[PDB]
Design a protein around this ligand. Structure first.
Ligand code: ZN
Ligand code: ZN
Length: 301
């Protein structure tokens, strides 16, 4: 129990992060989940056992609050919805990451072309899609809106970057931030440029870190790894981290290079590619780099 009626629920995931952190809220006769893991036997089983420990079934969870559309957070939302749960998702996900799951053919060609144009040589995504149960009627959340959930009051903080409609949930009185993947303690959360992403995802991400830095939160519980005791400090560390990565990427451009080959050294794979692309497009917008093609080869001015 992180607070009375607020519980950390670690769930195994078949991705390099290995474990996703879900948050269970119980109170005032209500039960809610922040994030849902995904449809594997190991993930479903772990979540069931967690709920059982609290005396609950899947069917007891009537409210779902999603930080973002990534499979490790969004994967079981449609399952819970099928049992009668109400699913909440930030509005900016709807035409992007949410559409990606709902309409497999909406971004398919662009997704592959983005890889190919940026030097990727000739699916795990299909395996992922099989583990994802998209909600049919999710309700759009808005930045700054206030939710009364299980006796607690949560402020919706739109924090784009890691995902377009990424939302953190902030308990203002307690100063407790449910950060999702906008902030992590050990590594940087991915900032990837995908076919459905906003124009400059890294710029969004750094502005989101600024927003969280000035928030005044007393503690952050994120989507992965351990608790974050000093939120401003970690936000400032992730700022500095990406500044170092930008400098590192500039150094790697000793000649014209593709995003694929660059991603091997900037990250000594799919996520590495998208992150590298995000950093390149940030640099290009600033004018620090240019590109020929397609096939795109980036160079340092
Ligand atoms: Zn994520
Ligand atoms: Zn995650």
């Amino acid at each position: 129990a992180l607070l009375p009626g607020l519980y950390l629920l670690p769930v195994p995931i078949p991705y390099p992060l290995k474990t996703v952190n879900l948050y269970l809220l119980q109170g005032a006769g209500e039960v809610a989940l922040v994030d849902t893991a995904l449809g594997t036997r190991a993930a479903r089983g772990a979540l069931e056992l967690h709920l059982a420990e609290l005396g609950l079934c899947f069917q007891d969870v009537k409210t779902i609050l999603l930080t973002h559309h990534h499979p490790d957070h969004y994967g079981l939302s449609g399952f819970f919805e099928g049992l009668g749960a109400r699913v909440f998702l930030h509005e900016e996900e709807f035409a992007r990451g949410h559409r990606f799951w709902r309409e497999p053919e909406a971004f398919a060609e662009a997704s592959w072309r983005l890889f190919l144009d940026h030097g990727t040589p000739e699916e795990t995504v299909e395996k992922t899609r099989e583990r994802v149960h998209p909600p049919q009627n999710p309700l759009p959340l808005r930045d700054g809106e206030a939710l009364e959930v299980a006796g607690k009051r949560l402020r919706v903080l739109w924090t784009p970057g890691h995902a377009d409609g990424h939302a953190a949930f902030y308990l203002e009185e307690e100063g407790v931030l449910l950060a999702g993947d906008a902030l992590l303690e050990k590594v940087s959360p991915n900032v990837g440029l995908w076919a459905y992403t906003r124009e400059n995802p890294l710029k969004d991400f750094l502005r989101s870190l600024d927003r969280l830095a000035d928030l005044g939160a007393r503690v952050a519980y994120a989507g992965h790894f351990g608790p974050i005791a000093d939120v401003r400090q970690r936000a400032e560390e992730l700022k500095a981290h990406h500044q170092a990565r930008l400098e590192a990427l500039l150094a790697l451009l000793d000649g014209p290079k593709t995003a694929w080959e660059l991603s091997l050294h900037l990250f000594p794979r799919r996520f590495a590619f998208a992150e590298t692309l995000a950093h390149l497009e940030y640099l290009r917008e600033e004018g620090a780099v240019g590109r020929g093609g397609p096939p795109y080869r980036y160079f340092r001015r």
